[PDB]
Structures are given as structure tokens and as C-alpha cells.
């Protein structure tokens, strides 16, 4: 089997995925502008009457009311979704931790290092005992 | 001369420890060899029997389909009879 | 003292050889442990999948039995209503 | 990480004290727990003779000492000696003052309360640790295996106990603690060696018999066949060199010493072997978790290191258990230090960091705090 | 699918909650309705142990839980647990927020008003559905059969009720509700198993006895002949393997457990069996629609799935009824989900689309709106 070609495929597909993310973001921006222009029609009122000005202002106030209601509803829904996302993230983190935390530790850091410390102490014991004479 | 003899005794004990290491290593290695072989044989047999069961299950699926169709037929006949 | 120095150096080279044998055994041990862990994990998976297959085979067999018996009874009744 | 400090995972045990900082793989210092006063008179002046050699120092001067273990069966019978052992462990084998380190002792199940309370009182008053926590020796051995279920048989040197656990919920009504362990096997081996002529009596020669037991004894797969074979051939007789020469030859004493585990009638104990107390401990559990306990039987502790025990025990349980269940016996190669590895893992957890018995809490409720919520 | 809005056809039941979107053939998620708190202590830290496992999760950890059904006999006795069950059903088994979906609950006949009012108040305040409607569990089972007349015997797990209907006009004075159902049969089976030595006591082992009842029990065509045969031969003894081995052999307990349906004197109930309450329910109807009800007797509900009940019931009714009338018992193979299939059909109708209890209507009249025109 091959192993380096696996990494080559990974690198190429990751770059391709980044390109797809970029183009999808550009498509989202274009569609955002398109839908914004769709819902928000432009108006021009050159040489207008005061009564029609009041009618347009009242219609805009009603639009403000409805848009604020919709933004409030979507904000509350998104905040509940964010709380749920945090809860699910916490639970999955707890699962992963209880699965993998015992598996990480400092293996044989000093156990291998024990070469002659006890042996050195034993030899120096006899040396120190003989140092008296 | 006495210092050299002390050195010799130290070397002797270290050689003893080394042979001890050799023996314990061999023993554990033979043990793991036994476990390896037994595990491998049992894994082979288990895979074989599981695949056998899978085949039988697929055959049962087909049998059940046949029976379901025939029951549909008999039910239609009975209701028309009614 | 000269003889003792000779024995000292001989035991010294022997001790170095001992240490090298020890390290080789250690590496072999780590290796075999790795292998055993892998094969045992495979054993777990094999046994579990075998069990799944066996259970499904059991369930399908039972359902086949029930439906077959019902079909046979209704066939007898179809003749009766003839 | 950052501020803060490391925890001391001590593990008193009975026979070998194992200690080390939390988060490693193996205990830093492992040494027998014996304190031996000299017994002869002593004529050399100025030799610098101390009044009590503890730890591994008294296993080298054991020729003129009277070694005496301070822990008999899990419980501690001689508090001054145990305090001396702890002081040695902290100051000379680890060289870390206890004023700046939490400690995590371990205790056998079903032990007297006074032992645990005195342990915490010592740790808080004499050594003056910041916070200490006492944990059951079997839950740690279950941590080290990386499981979360299973019934663990922790046959130490003092006491053999068998704690079943499912999904993290321990079953307190199914703990079967039996007081046969490595020390009784040493005494029985020392008692059956007399059938060939070798007499070991002194408390120092008990160590020699322990070494014989460790290096030569093994558990027979089938007892009667081995007894018949050893009585006809001579392929079993293994020899061993005493600390002074005069090699000895052990015949069928090899597999008769550790056989006491499965037939405690040899040393006059009434109870059933470690092969049947596990099955009884399982049968006390609920009917729906018996399959998982059957499949995840865990071995731990030093005495379960006999060559050939993981097969004898499996054969016995398979004989007792229903024929359909699968019996599997987990016997990791790092059996001896399994409890301490589990202790290190538990002390290294973030979720556990608020379970320590903080010193101010002890000051408010006294030593009886250990039985309270902080278990 | 896409735009538009689909209805949620939930069906609380008692023993199995069945739910799914309107317009399909089978419920999307079917799981027992049990909420079980853990009962032991728990020693592993950080295992992520929750405080209550509901639904099908508590049928896998039932070894260390104390399962308790929140619905006793149709009525709901523990509102917090029922709210938990509903929350689980909406969010984890269907993953659709209730803010954008009408709901169609089901309720047994002759139930207390407060139960229904509390149900609608919960659905409108906590889950905040757009509109909910409560329907009688028997009319749906009549929908699923594609009929428009007939007397339906819906022997669930909580309560057995027998609603006769003609030409779409329900007869409110002829509903005979009897409280013997699958749960009492489980308890009686668990009580007669003790005659062979098998003792099941724990609330977890009630599930094992339920499995035995489902897989082995059957309804005898003639009771005395079966009792005589099972007492001489041994062709009936079927064995079954417990969740841990130790197979058991059920003798004449096989057809004695479900016989309680036709002789409620076994469990001490006074009333007559399901074979005679149907005939009584028919005889209360008018003299001119008795032939149609005789010819279109419908069976539904889980407990009517015993092998051989559609023949025993027909034999009994033919014995009771006049000799000229033809007795026919409709027993569709999809009996268990018949109520839910009917619920889906009813929710998918265009004519029904204006019968929902809209939220503004509830805001104007309070929870007592359910008893009003919007039934």
C-alpha cells in the first residue's frame, strides 16, 4: 500500500476544501446582496407631497416594528440554539475526556533513568565505611 | 590489589543481575507468544463462524420475503371469499 | 593484583555485553506488547460482530416461523371456504 | 497548566510502600515497609549506629535486626512505626516537604474507621499537608485498566478484596473481603519447607522464604495431576542458592504454596478460594449486569503475579459459571503497580480537583470529616 | 418535503411512546416510557453520569436504575416525569422544535378532566406548540382499519376500553372501560412464575418478565383441555435464556398468564372478561345496528397480539351471540401501531385542518377550552 500518496491526497483535498469554502462564501455574499435588493426595494420621492411623506414615514415605522419583532424572535431562537450548542459541546467534551484522559501520562520518564543510583549509593557506603581507616 | 578485588565483586553482582534480566525476558516473551497464538487462532475461528451466520441470515431474509408475498395472496383470496 | 586487574577488565567487557543484551530484550518486549494489544482489539471486534449476526439470524428465523404458520392456517381456511 | 502544584500519590499498602508524583507511569520509590530495631549489644564505639533502620536500609542490615511490619492486615497496628515510615517516605525517598503537596492515600475496603481517622489526623497535624484524600484500593486498579465496569480482585500482600463495579456505580453490598494474602502464603511456604529439612524461624529468614516464593512458586493448572507428576518424575525440582551457599531443592512445594489461594483449608481457613468468592461476589449483583462482570474480570495486586494464575482462575470460573457466558480475565503485565498507576490517573484529573479534603474543612469538623461527603 | 407545515402525531400511550410525522406508515421513534434515577452511590469521577435516563437509554442501564412509569392507568400520576418524557421525544428522538409543528395527542376514554387540561396547558405553555388536538384512542384505531362502523376493543398496556361506533356516530352510553391490561398480566405472570422457583422482584426484572410474556405466552383456544394436556405430556414446556444464562422452563404458565383477560377473577378483579364486556357493549346499542357491530368487531392495541386470541374471542362471542348473526373479528397484522396509523390519517385530512385548538383560542378561554366545541 502507499502512505505518502495518502498525505498528498489529504493536502490536495484540504486545499480544494478551502477553495470551496471561499467560493461558497462569495456565493453567499452575492445572494445576500441579491435578496437584500429583493426585499428592500429602492424608492425616490423627488418633488413629493407632505401627506405622501407622512404615509411613507408611517409605513416605514410599521416596517420597523415588524423587522424588530422578527429580529427579536430570531435572536431569542439563536440564543437558545447557542445554549444548546454549548451544552452539547460540554457533554461531548465530557465523553471524550472520560474516554481519553486516562490514556495520557508520562511513560517511563525516570524509570529508565535508574541506572546505578542505588548501586552507586551501595558502593559509596562501603567506601565511606572504609574511609574511617 | 584490594581495590581491584572490590571492583571484581561489583562486576560479579552486575553479571548476575544481567543473567537474571535475560531469564525473565525470555519467560515473559514465551508467555506472550502463547497468548498471541491462541488469540490469533480464536480470532480466525470467530470471523469464520460470524460470516457463516451472516450468510444464513441473508437466506432467511429471502425466505421471509417469499412468505410475505404468499400471505398477501391468501389474504386477498379470503377477503374476496367473504 | 595483576591477575585481579585482568579479571576486572574481563568482567567489564562482559558487563557491557550484558547491558546490550538487556536493551535488546527490552525492545523486543515493547514490540510484542504492541502486537498483542492490536490482536486483542481485533478479537473484541470479531466477537461483537459475531454476536450481532447471531442475534439477527435468530430474530429473522422466528419471524419466518410465525408468518409461515399463519399462511398455512389461512390456506386451510381458503379450502374450507371453497 | 501553570500555577499550582503536583500531588503526592502515596500508597501505604502492606509489604511494599509505593509512592511518586501524580502524572507519571511508575512509582518513584518502592521499598519494603519494615522498621527494625537492632537486637544485639554493639561494641564498636562511634560507628554511628542508629536506633531504627526503616525501608530498604533494613533489608541490607537484616542480619542483626528484628524486622516488624507496622501493617498487619490492611489495618495499622503500630502507629509510631507507621509515622516513621511516612516520614522516611516523604523526606528521604522523595525529598519533598509535605507542606506544599496534596496527598492521596489508599485504604482497603471494610477497614475500621479509627484507622482512617487516625491516618487523616496524622497527615494533617504532624506532616501538615495542604489537603489529603483517601480512596479505595480497588477503584484505582479499575482506573488503571481504562475500563469503567468490571469486578476487580485485588489480592495484595495483606488482604484480598473483590469489589464489583458497574458503569461507575459501585455495589456496596457485594464486596467480599478475605484476609488470605501473600503474607499467609509466605508463612505456609515456610511451614511446608520443614518437610525437607530446611528450617527458617528468624524474622529475617522470612524475607528469604519470601524470595523463594517469588522466584520459584507457580500456580498449577490442575492440582491433582501436578501432585501425581511431581511424585513420579523429577522434572519439577528447581534449586535455589541461599544467601550463604548450601543450595536447596524445592519439589512439589512449588505449586502447593500458592494453591492455598484456591483452597484456604490448607492454612485452616474456612472460607472458599479466590476462585469462588469472585463468583459469589458476582451472583450477589443484579441479574442484568452479570454478563458484563463475567466478561471484564480484572486482576490486580502483587500476589496475582504467579505464573499460570490467569488460566487456573479462568478454568475455575468457567466451571462454575453458566456455559453460555464468556469468561475473560484481564491480567495486565503491570499488575503490581496497577493501583498506583490508577491513583496517578485519578489525581491528575481536573474533575477530581475539588474533592480534596481542604485543611480548613478539617479544622471545622475534626478528623471525622473523612466519613462525610468528602469520602 | 419542504415548505408547508407537517403535524406531529404523538401518542403517549402507557408503556411505549409512539411518535412520528403525519402522513407516514409507521411511527418514527418507538421507545418505552420509563424514567429511572440511579440508586447506588457512584465512585468514578468525571464519568458524565446524568441524574435521570429516560426512554430507550434506561432500558440498557437498567441494572443500576429504578425505572418508574409516569403513566399508571391511562391517567398521568407524575407530571414532571411526563414533561421530561415529552421533552425527550420532541428534541432527541425527532429533533424538531415544537414551536413550528401542530401536535395530536391521544387519550383514553372516560379519563379525568384534570389530566387532559394539564396536558393541554403543558403543551401550550412549556413547549409552546402552535396548536394541539386531543383525540380518543379508539376512533383512530377505527380510522386505520378503513371502516366507518364497528366496535373496537383497544386493549393497550394501561387500560382496555371498548368503544362502539356506527356510521361515524359514536355511542357515548355504550363505552365499557376496564382497567385490566398488559401491565396487570405482567404482574400476574411474575406472580405465578414463583411456583417453579424463579423469583423476580426488582423493578428492573419486571422488564425481563415482560419479555418472557411477549415471547412465550399464548392464548389457549380451550382452557380446560390445555390445562389437562399440559399436566400429562411435556410438549408445551418452552425454555428461555435469562440475560445471564440459567435457562428457565415455562410449563402451563404459558397460557395461564393471558387467560386472565377472559377470566379477571384470577387477579381478583370482579368484572367479566374481554369476551363478555364486548357483548355487553353491543347489547347496550340500539336493536338495529347490532348486526353491523357483530360483523365488524375490530381488535387493536398491543395486548391483542397474543398468538391465538382472534380465534378464542370469536368462539366466545359466537357462544354468547344469537346463532344467526355472523361474528367476524378484524385483526390486522399492524395491530400495535393501529392507533398511530389512524392518527396519521386523521392529521393528514383536509376536512380536519380547522379543528385544531389554535393558541389564540386558548389564550381567550384558558385550558378549559378542550372540553368545549374543539373537543
Amino acid at each position: 500500500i502507499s502512505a505518502s500518496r495518502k498525505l498528498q491526497l489529504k493536502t490536495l483535498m484540504l486545499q480544494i476544501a478551502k477553495q470551496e469554502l471561499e467560493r461558497e462564501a462569495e456565493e453567499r455574499r452575492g445572494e445576500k446582496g441579491r435578496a437584500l435588493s429583493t426585499r428592500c426595494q429602492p424608492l425616490e420621492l423627488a418633488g413629493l407631497s407632505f401627506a405622501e411623506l407622512q404615509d411613507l414615514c408611517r409605513q416605514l415605522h410599521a416596517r420597523v416594528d415588524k423587522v424588530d419583532e422578527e429580529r427579536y424572535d430570531v435572536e431569542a431562537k439563536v440564543t437558545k440554539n447557542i445554549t444548546e450548542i454549548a451544552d452539547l459541546n460540554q457533554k461531548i467534551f465530557d465523553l471524550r475526556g472520560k474516554f481519553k484522559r486516562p490514556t495520557l501520562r508520562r511513560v517511563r520518564i525516570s524509570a529508565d533513568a535508574m541506572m546505578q543510583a542505588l548501586l552507586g549509593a551501595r558502593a559509596k557506603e562501603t567506601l565511606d565505611l572504609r574511609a574511617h581507616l | 590489589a584490594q581495590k581491584d578485588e572490590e571492583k571484581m565483586e561489583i562486576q560479579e553482582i552486575q553479571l548476575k543481575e544481567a543473567k537474571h534480566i535475560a531469564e525473565d525476558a525470555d519467560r515473559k516473551y514465551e508467555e506472550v507468544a502463547r497468548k498471541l497464538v491462541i488469540i490469533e487462532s480464536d480470532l480466525e475461528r470467530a470471523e469464520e463462524r460470524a460470516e457463516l451466520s451472516e450468510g444464513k441470515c441473508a437466506e432467511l431474509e429471502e425466505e421471509l420475503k417469499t412468505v410475505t408475498n404468499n400471505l398477501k395472496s391468501l389474504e386477498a383470496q379470503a377477503e374476496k371469499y367473504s | 593484583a595483576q591477575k585481579d586487574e585482568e579479571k576486572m577488565e574481563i568482567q567489564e567487557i562482559q558487563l557491557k555485553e550484558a547491558k546490550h543484551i538487556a536493551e535488546d530484550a527490552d525492545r523486543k518486549y515493547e514490540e510484542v506488547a504492541r502486537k498483542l494489544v492490536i490482536i486483542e482489539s481485533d478479537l473484541e471486534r470479531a466477537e461483537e460482530r459475531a454476536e450481532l449476526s447471531e442475534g439477527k439470524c435468530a430474530e429473522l428465523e422466528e419471524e419466518l416461523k410465525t408468518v409461515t404458520n399463519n399462511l398455512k392456517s389461512l390456506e386451510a381456511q381458503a379450502e374450507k371456504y371453497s | 497548566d501553570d500555577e499550582e502544584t503536583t500531588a503526592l500519590v502515596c500508597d501505604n499498602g502492606s509489604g511494599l510502600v509505593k509512592a511518586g508524583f501524580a502524572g507519571d507511569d511508575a512509582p518513584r520509590a518502592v521499598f519494603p515497609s519494615i522498621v527494625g530495631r537492632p537486637r544485639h549489644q554493639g561494641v564498636m564505639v562511634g560507628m554511628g549506629q542508629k536506633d531504627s533502620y526503616v525501608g530498604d536500609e533494613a533489608q541490607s542490615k537484616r542480619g542483626i535486626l528484628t524486622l516488624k511490619y507496622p501493617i498487619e492486615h490492611g489495618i495499622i497496628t503500630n502507629w509510631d512505626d507507621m509515622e516513621k515510615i511516612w516520614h522516611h517516605t516523604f523526606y528521604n525517598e522523595l525529598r519533598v516537604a509535605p507542606e506544599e503537596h496534596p496527598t492521596l492515600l489508599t485504604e482497603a475496603p471494610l477497614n475500621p474507621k479509627a484507622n482512617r481517622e487516625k491516618m487523616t489526623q496524622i497527615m494533617f497535624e504532624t506532616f501538615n499537608v495542604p489537603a489529603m484524600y483517601v480512596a479505595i484500593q480497588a477503584v484505582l486498579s479499575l482506573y488503571a485498566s481504562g475500563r469503567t465496569t468490571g469486578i476487580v480482585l485485588d489480592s495484595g500482600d495483606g488482604v484480598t478484596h473483590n469489589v464489583p463495579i458497574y458503569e461507575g456505580y459501585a455495589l456496596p453490598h457485594a464486596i467480599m473481603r478475605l484476609d488470605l494474602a501473600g503474607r499467609d502464603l509466605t508463612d505456609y511456604l515456610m511451614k511446608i519447607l520443614t518437610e525437607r529439612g530446611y528450617s527458617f524461624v528468624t524474622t529475617a529468614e522470612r524475607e528469604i522464604v519470601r524470595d523463594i516464593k517469588e522466584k520459584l512458586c507457580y500456580v498449577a493448572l490442575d492440582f491433582e495431576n501436578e501432585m501425581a507428576t511431581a511424585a513420579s518424575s523429577s522434572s519439577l525440582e528447581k534449586s535455589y542458592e541461599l544467601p550463604d551457599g548450601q543450595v536447596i531443592t524445592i519439589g512439589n512445594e512449588r505449586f502447593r504454596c500458592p494453591e492455598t489461594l484456591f483452597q484456604p483449608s490448607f492454612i485452616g481457613m474456612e472460607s472458599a478460594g479466590i476462585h469462588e468468592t469472585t463468583y459469589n461476589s458476582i451472583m450477589k449483583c443484579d441479574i442484568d449486569i452479570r454478563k458484563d462482570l463475567y466478561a471484564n474480570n480484572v486482576l490486580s495486586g502483587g500476589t496475582t503475579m504467579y505464573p499460570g494464575i490467569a488460566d487456573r482462575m479462568q478454568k475455575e470460573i468457567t466451571a462454575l459459571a453458566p456455559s453460555t457466558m464468556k469468561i475473560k480475565i484481564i491480567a495486565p503485565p503491570e499488575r503490581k503497580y496497577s493501583v498506583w498507576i490508577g491513583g496517578s490517573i485519578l489525581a491528575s484529573l481536573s474533575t477530581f480537583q475539588q474533592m480534596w479534603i481542604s485543611k480548613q474543612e478539617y479544622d471545622e469538623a475534626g478528623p471525622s470529616i473523612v466519613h462525610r461527603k468528602c469520602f | 418535503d419542504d415548505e408547508e407545515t407537517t403535524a406531529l402525531v404523538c401518542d403517549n400511550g402507557s408503556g411505549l411512546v409512539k411518535a412520528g410525522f403525519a402522513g407516514d406508515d409507521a411511527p418514527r421513534a418507538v421507545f418505552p416510557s420509563i424514567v429511572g434515577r440511579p440508586r447506588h452511590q457512584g465512585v468514578m469521577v468525571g464519568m458524565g453520569q446524568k441524574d435521570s435516563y429516560v426512554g430507550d437509554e434506561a432500558q440498557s442501564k437498567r441494572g443500576i436504575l429504578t425505572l418508574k412509569y409516569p403513566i399508571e392507568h391511562g391517567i398521568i400520576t407524575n407530571w414532571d416525569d411526563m414533561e421530561k418524557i415529552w421533552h425527550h421525544t420532541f428534541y432527541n428522538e425527532l429533533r424538531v422544535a415544537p414551536e413550528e409543528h401542530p401536535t395530536l395527542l391521544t387519550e383514553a376514554p372516560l379519563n379525568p378532566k384534570a389530566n387532559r387540561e394539564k396536558m393541554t396547558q403543558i403543551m401550550f405553555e412549556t413547549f409552546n406548540v402552535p396548536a394541539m388536538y386531543v383525540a380518543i384512542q379508539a376512533v383512530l384505531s377505527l380510522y386505520a382499519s378503513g371502516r366507518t362502523t364497528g366496535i373496537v376493543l383497544d386493549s393497550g398496556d394501561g387500560v382496555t376500553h371498548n368503544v362502539p361506533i356506527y356510521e361515524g356516530y359514536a355511542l357515548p352510553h355504550a363505552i365499557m372501560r376496564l382497567d385490566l391490561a398488559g401491565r396487570d398480566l405482567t404482574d400476574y405472570l411474575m406472580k405465578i412464575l414463583t411456583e417453579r422457583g424463579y423469583s423476580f422482584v426488582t423493578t428492573a426484572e419486571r422488564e425481563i418478565v415482560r419479555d418472557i410474556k411477549e415471547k412465550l405466552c399464548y392464548v389457549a383456544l380451550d382452557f380446560e383441555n390445555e390445562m389437562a394436556t399440559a399436566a400429562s405430556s411435556s410438549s408445551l414446556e418452552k425454555s428461555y435464556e435469562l440475560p445471564d444464562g440459567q435457562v428457565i422452563t415455562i410449563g402451563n404458565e404459558r397460557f395461564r398468564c393471558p387467560e386472565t383477560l377472559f377470566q379477571p377473577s384470577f387477579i381478583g378483579m370482579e368484572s367479566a372478561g374481554i369476551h363478555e364486556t364486548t357483548y355487553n357493549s353491543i347489547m347496550k346499542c340500539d336493536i338495529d345496528i347490532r348486526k353491523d357491530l357483530y360483523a365488524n368487531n375490530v381488535l387493536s392495541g398491543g395486548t391483542t397480539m397474543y398468538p391465538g386470541i382472534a380465534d378464542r374471542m370469536q368462539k366466545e362471542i359466537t357462544a354468547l351471540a344469537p346463532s344467526t348473526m355472523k361474528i367476524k373479528i378484524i385483526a390486522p397484522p399492524e395491530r400495535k401501531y393501529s392507533v398511530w396509523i389512524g392518527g396519521s390519517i386523521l392529521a393528514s385530512l383536509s376536512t380536519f385542518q380547522q379543528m385544531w385548538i389554535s393558541k389564540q383560542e386558548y389564550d381567550e378561554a384558558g385550558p378549559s377550552i378542550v372540553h368545549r366545541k374543539c373537543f
Binding site: 500500500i1 502507499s2 502512505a3 505518502s4 495518502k6 498525505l7 498528498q8 491526497l9 489529504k10 493536502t11 490536495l12 483535498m13 484540504l14 480544494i16 476544501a17 478551502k18 470551496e20 469554502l21 461558497e24 529508565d112 | - | 471486534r45 460482530r49 | - | -
Partner: protein, 160 residues
Amino acid sequence: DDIYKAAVEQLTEEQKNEFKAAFDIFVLGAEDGCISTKELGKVMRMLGQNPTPEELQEMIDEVDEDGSGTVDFDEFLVMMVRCMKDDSKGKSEEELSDLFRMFDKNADGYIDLEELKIMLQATGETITEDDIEELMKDGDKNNDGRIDYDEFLEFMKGVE
């Protein structure tokens, strides 16, 4: 290719002196200057840590494309520094989740054989028939016939 040459170009003489001291035992004399890779198996153990022997064989084979079995100080340097951890930050975990969301264009939450197969085909990369099954083993760690979040996460873990 020369990518790992660029990666190893970080370590200048500071570690090159130590590498030459280690490699001196390799060039022990009595040779014609070929300088094979024979000692490397224990040379990588000059400090103690050693990756998988299969990875060692891959390192032996992949460099020295002429198959000369000659280990230049540059290739020896790059292969030995590979023993030290070398990862280019592995994108970002949130970025990885976004990449998976792009991968799951079917909006199923899982990737099957055809999904990832077509995804790789869109790159135009030459893929063998001995492949595809290899990627199936790489992805179907649970052997459930699909790609879950964890399978992708460990699949792309530490790769950049």
C-alpha cells in the same frame, strides 16, 4: 518532495553539530564513501524516542529516490528531525468543522463511499483501484459503512 527540505531548513548548525556527532558513529571508516542507511535503525534511537518501525522503513525508502542507499547529511538531517514533532498547526478545529460541513454537501451528517469518492474525483487526482478500499479502511474506523465526525477528525488530525 523538497517540502520537508524546507521544513528542516529551520534547524541550523545549532542542531547540525549534534547530528554530525551522532552520525560520526555511522561513518566508522573502512568504506568507499557510499554511506548506507544500515545504522539508522539504532541511530534514530540516539536519544531514545523512536516512531513506528513501518514509519522508519517509509523514511528509509522515500528519501534517496535514486535508491543509492546513500544517506546525505541533508536527508539524514530531515529524517532524524522528523522524529521530533513537526505539524503545521493542523488548520483549526472550528475550521476543520467548517471543512467537514463543506464535505457533507449531502447534509446527511455522514460521508459514504460515493460521496468522498466523487469529492476526490473532482480534484482530478489519479486514483488506483487498489485505492478507494484503502480510503474506506482509512475512514470506516467504526466499520459502519459511513464517515462520522470522529472518523474525519482523527482522519485529518494534525495534517497540514
